[PDB]
Backbone:
């Protein structure tokens, strides 16, 4: 069985290149531990450029840069940081003009958070035609096309890893042949790696039987609609697996309306809305990102590079399972860990 | 020097064969006929439907197809049988292909020899609710694929071509009355690479 897909899985990559697993594990350990300052001072401050999407309602990227900068400081790395923002709805010509700002700084490291398919020309230009070291965020599955020359670092919270942790928990709690339904994201990548990964594992390890599955429009409304449609046609399920936050919270409302709170349901990601729902007992389980890990990891990778140590190609931040049985003390402790740098 | 342009041409013909089948598979899977089949299960209406699409573009059809719901296979077109792909092997193919919209290379033994296949699935959707009713599978069988070898030779204007997997020939375009046979060929080697995944497959072309 050889899937002919253009990306390495995260675990697949670490298995194909065993030394990469050792490097990734060392980075994981350094990220959790207290800072160990740079042991090889630089003659000048390093130049870093970061490309973020503008006009974001969430503070995900604000926290990310806060965590990155704080770790650099605590590691005694002198730097000059240039931030570059693209307009999400602008066309490709306009965004590519904005990205010139990232090249004008003549960076030693360029951190890039935008989609690498849409902006493939830019990222391949950085790899093929510049002397900066490219760090990609929101991707943990190395591009096979770049096998001969990979970016300096890929970071993110791997979708398959998070989904497998959820599959393991569902597998422990429910007996073999348990009936379940799945609410996907919209058709595409997220549904493939969060949804079909989960289905594959619980079917293989626990013999669970999928009763129904629905693609959604990735909104609370569509998750609500899909849950109602699913339960009208397939009421005899013990849980629903949801691939995203808003979809899950829509299904939660559907469960309350139908008086089917006996059906267990998960979140995905563990943000503030989910954790509120967990504490109310509206969501039964979720997988929570330790947000600040990726910002800290990028700083540690740079440190190792400045110390002439080998740096892993890929890194996925830590996840923690959270359930409605967890105490408020436990959830607060997880929040403080996830935001250990970006808070305050 | 000129080994490069020949390799790129035959790999483009190879890719275009599967891209065309992929495009039909996606479009056929949106069809109202297949969706209605999940309810009434009328094999005669379904078979006539697939006969008509294959008529228009005969070269770009799969060697076999089958449909599943979430429990298992509910229909196959009957073509798998003579390839040695029995019902238990079909069930295994359905289990192995666990992601949609992606070709899988599968090399599996049967009672009548090894079968080297490219297989993919697409979800069958209810356009109004988003329900996944099940999956549609398409399989290309590479072994002794007369039509495919003939198309690779014809469109690349080379004299002949042999498909190989780990130095064992799977198919060839040789008519039979030429100065050489397949074993003698085993001039240009072209590894089959799909989405930058290296496979055990190789295309051997004869230009001299």
Residues:
């Amino acid at each position: 069985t050889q899937v002919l897909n253009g990306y390495w899985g995260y675990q697949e990559f670490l298995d194909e290149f065993p030394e990469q697993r050792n490097l990734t594990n060392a980075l994981s350990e350094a990220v959790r531990a207290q800072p160990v300052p740079l042991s090889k001072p630089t003659q000048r401050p390093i130049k870093i450029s970061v490309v973020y999407p503008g006009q974001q309602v969430s503070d995900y990227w604000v926290r990310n840069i806060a965590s990155f900068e704080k770790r650099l400081y605590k590691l005694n790395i002198n730097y000059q940081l240039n931030q570059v923002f693209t307009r999400p709805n602008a066309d490709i010509k306009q965004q590519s003009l904005s990205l010139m700002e990232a090249l004008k700084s003549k960076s030693d490291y360029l951190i890039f958070t935008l989609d690498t398919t849409r902006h493939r020309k830019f990222v391949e230009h950085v790899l093929d035609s510049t002397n900066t070291k490219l760090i990609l965020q929101n991707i943990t599955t190395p591009v096979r096309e770049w096998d001969k020359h990979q970016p300096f670092l890929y970071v993110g919270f791997d979708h398959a890893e998070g989904s497998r942790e959820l599959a393991t928990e569902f597998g422990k709690f429910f007996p073999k042949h348990t009936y379940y339904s799945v609410l996907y994201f919209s058709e595409g990548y997220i549904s493939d790696v969060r949804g079909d990964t989960f289905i594959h594992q619980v079917n293989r390890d626990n013999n669970f039987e999928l009763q129904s599955a629905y693609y959604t429009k990735a909104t609370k409304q569509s998750g609500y609609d899909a849950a109602k449609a699913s339960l009208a046609k397939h009421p005899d399920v013990d849980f629903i697996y949801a691939c995203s936050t808003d979809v899950a919270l829509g299904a939660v409302d559907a469960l309350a309306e139908l008086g089917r709170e006996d059906i267990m349901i998960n979140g995905w990601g563990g943000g503030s809305a989910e954790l509120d729902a967990i504490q109310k007992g509206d969501l039964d389980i979720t997988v929570m990102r330790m947000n600040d890990d990726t910002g800290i990891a990028m700083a540690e990778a740079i440190k190792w590079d400045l110390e002439d140590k080998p740096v892993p190609t890929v890194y996925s931040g830590d996840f923690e399972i959270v359930t409605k049985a967890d105490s408020p003390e436990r959830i607060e402790a997880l929040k403080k860990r996830a935001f250990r740098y970006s808070d305050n | 020097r000129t080994k490069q342009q020949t390799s790129a041409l035959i790999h483009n013909i190879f890719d275009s064969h599967f891209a065309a089948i992929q495009i039909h598979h996606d479009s056929n899977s949106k069809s109202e006929v297949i969706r209605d089949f999940y309810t009434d299960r009328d094999t005669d209406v379904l078979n006539f439907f697939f006969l008509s699409i294959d008529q228009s573009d005969p070269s770009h059809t799969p060697e076999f197809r089958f449909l599943t719901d979430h429990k298992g296979i509910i229909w196959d077109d009957g073509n798998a049988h003579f390839y040695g792909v029995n019902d238990l092997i079909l069930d295994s193919l359905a289990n192995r292909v666990s992601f949609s919209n992606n070709w899988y290379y599968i090399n599996v033994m049967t009672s009548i020899g090894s079968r080297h296949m490219l297989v993919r699935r697409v979800p069958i959707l209810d356009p109004s609710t988003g329900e996944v009713l099940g999956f549609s599978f398409n399989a290309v069988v590479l072994d002794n694929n007369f039509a495919l070898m003939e198309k690779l030779k014809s469109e690349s204007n080379v004299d002949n071509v042999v498909l190989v997997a780990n130095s064992v020939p799977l198919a060839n375009s040789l008519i039979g009355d030429e100065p050489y046979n397949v074993a003698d060929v085993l001039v240009i080697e072209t590894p089959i690479v799909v989405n930058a995944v290296t496979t055990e497959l190789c295309l051997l072309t004869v230009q001299d």
